[PDB]
Design a protein around this ligand. Structure first.
Ligand SMILES: CC(C)CCC[C@@H](C)[C@H]1CC[C@H]2[C@@H]3CC=C4C[C@@H](OC(=O)CCC(=O)O)CC[C@]4(C)[C@H]3CC[C@]12C
Ligand SMILES: CC(C)CCC[C@@H](C)[C@H]1CC[C@H]2[C@@H]3CC=C4C[C@@H](OC(=O)CCC(=O)O)CC[C@]4(C)[C@H]3CC[C@]12C
Ligand SMILES: CCCCCCCCCCCCO[C@@H]1O[C@H](CO)[C@@H](O[C@H]2O[C@H](CO)[C@@H](O)[C@H](O)[C@H]2O)[C@H](O)[C@H]1O
Ligand SMILES: CCCCCCCCCCCCO[C@@H]1O[C@H](CO)[C@@H](O[C@H]2O[C@H](CO)[C@@H](O)[C@H](O)[C@H]2O)[C@H](O)[C@H]1O
Lengths: 54, 54
């Protein structure tokens, strides 16, 4: 449940952030999103299989 | 009238712009605003004196 609520399914390649150091909203880029989301989906499937067995 | 409507009185030292090349709104800085606005005010005063004489 925590993994589902925290990370989700897909990893956004493009992010928009606006904190104190940055004067206005800025656009940052993430590296290798596809591999991260694929492996996250695989981990979620493995956890679901383990839950079903339990 | 054209000078009053176009430029105004004060020259903003800080500008906020958002055009097609710039993804989001960005903050640009102007150099020597005080001298520009002072000389513009002097030119406006000279034009007003000339208008009064005319
Ligand atoms: C032992 C058995 C029951 C395991 C079954 C595994 C499922 C819990 C997993 C396997 C594949 C997963 C799917 C793979 C791909 C996607 C697309 C994905 O779409 C997006 O990321 C874009 C849309 C959105 O933001 O939801 C939404 C989740 C979903 C349906 C996943 C939902 C969860 C699924 C069905
Ligand atoms: C022959 C005689 C009638 C000439 C008179 C000259 C005036 C037309 C000029 C001289 C000084 C000028 C002033 C000098 C400084 C300012 C402050 C200036 O304030 C700002 O820039 C911030 C506020 C705003 O945005 O209006 C507004 C215009 C004003 C009153 C100017 C209005 C026009 C004035 C009165
Ligand atoms: C052992 C048990 C552990 C229990 C753990 C419970 C953790 C709870 C975390 C609460 C977090 C609240 O803040 C939560 O942040 C996440 C991610 O940061 C946001 O999540 C959002 O962005 C992430 C990526 O950043 C996307 O993958 C997701 O789909 C989207 O919803 C949630 O919208 C927000 O609700
Ligand atoms: C010989 C006669 C010539 C007649 C000339 C008539 C020119 C008319 C120009 C119309 C322009 C309309 O666009 C006009 O742009 C100016 C400046 O770009 C804006 O002006 C705004 O920004 C400028 C600085 O950039 C400030 O100094 C000004 O106080 C503020 O109002 C006006 O808010 C907008 O109305």
């Amino acid at each position: 449940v925590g993994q589902y609520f925290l990370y989700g399914f897909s990893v956004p390649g493009l992010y928009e952030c606006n904190r104190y150091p940055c004067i206005k909203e800025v656009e940052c880029y993430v590296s290798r999103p596809t591999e991260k989301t694929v492996f996250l989906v695989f981990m979620f499937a493995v956890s679901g299989i383990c839950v079903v067995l339990n």
